[model samples]
Target: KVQIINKKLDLSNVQSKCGGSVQIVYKPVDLSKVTSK
Candidate 1:
């Protein structure tokens, strides 16, 4: 992958396809744990 994601709370989530393609995430997330794209 492009290393667009990593393990962190601020990041939260974003998968392979559209990860770096966007500017930001406007929705809320389940953040008991942390992961990112």
Candidate 2:
């Protein structure tokens, strides 16, 4: 299932075919964390 945490963030709890529960976190991009090559 998926849960919405905020406007730019979310979380998901899912089961894989391998038979295990996985937790996933989703978030928006932070330009401050980016750097030019």
Candidate 3:
């Protein structure tokens, strides 16, 4: 038997998807909880 799995990476909710001619109503997100280490 063979099994396959697929995953999708989506950041559309956090950032803009279309390049232009679109209005985004996103508010500023605090980055204090984000760690880059």
TM-score of each: 0.19, 0.20, 0.20
Worst ten in a row by lDDT for model 1: 1-10
Q: What is each predicted model's overall lDDT from 0 to 1?
A: 0.57, 0.51, 0.55
Instruction: Give the least accurate 10-residue stretch of model 2, judged by summed lDDT.
Output: 4-13
Off by over 4 Å in 3: 11-20, 25-37
Collision count of model 2: 0
What would you estimate as the lDDT of candidate 1? 0.57
Off-target runs (Cα >4 Å) in candidate 1 are: 1-8, 11-22, 31-37
Error in Å for residue 10 of model 1: 2.1
Residues 1-37 of candidate 3: C-alpha lDDT, one tens digit per residue: 9776555553554544776668575876754443333
Instruction: Say what the RMSD of model 3 is.
Output: 9.4
Candidate 2, residue 21: Cα displacement in angstroms equals 0.8
Q: What's the distance in Å from true for residue 9, model 1?
A: 3.7
Predicted candidate 1 versus true structure: per-residue lDDT over 1-37, tens digit per residue: 4556554445556556755466666877664855553
